[PDB]
């Protein structure tokens, strides 16, 4: 489902108060399939790596988890976090539809972001239904 | 690289001290590409879903981490642990050229498993090299 216009603002808006509120690099909401639908950044951060990859390798990485839950009594997990020896990337749906991808680093918390994604999925999930449905 | 005879035996034996150690379902080494080299299970344990698939995800879940790795500050990523609400499977890498998974339940401690695979892949690893060289 793309967005555009007021709720995008609205799904762009959510993306901006988690960088403060966890102090890290890239947030980034994309539908399941792998296609951004948006994308925001710290001022106080480098370029962003080629996102329009980033988010569609975490949705090519979705039915990559997904298929392994079949066995461990569940459809599908959602909230995951991947940590670098530096850098550490979120990984979380927002909706039956949508995937949330934060990029932390040294500068945050393993725990004020963990905080500020699902919570934030809540908000964007929110905005999802909103997106397809009037 | 594929496993067979004494030292596949060898492989296949630290796979069962683990799940001793562990108490949980199925501890499995692979080459990083997606083929089964081995696969223990838990006599307590019920049949193990199609195995032959569970690996090869992971490999296909691979380099569907690693591509994300760049704007991390690293290469690729090892250890991680992906638990649903029932149960959760484990996934690392057993060298430059193996990936070990395990499975567990709940009848298992998200830090007895931790514990008792990477210091298993570090055993396996040691084999891995054994088995393509000499």
Known sequence: LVL??????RAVEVLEETLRETGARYALLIDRKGFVLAHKEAL???KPPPLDTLATLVASNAA???????????AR??????????????V????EHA????VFDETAPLGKV????????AALARI???ALAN
């Open 4 to 9: 555009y216009g007021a709720p995008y603002e």
């Open 92 to 95: 979380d749906e927002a909706g």
């Open 77 to 90: 997990f959602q909230e995951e976090v991947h940590q670098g020896e530096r850098m550490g990337l979120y």
């Open 99 to 102: 995937l949330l991808v934060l």
């Open 114 to 121: 963990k905080l500020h994604g699902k919570a934030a999925a």
């Open 128 to 130: 999802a239904e909103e």
């Open 44 to 46: 106080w951060a480098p």
């Open 64 to 74: 990559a988890t997904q298929a392994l839950a079949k066995l461990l009594g569940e």
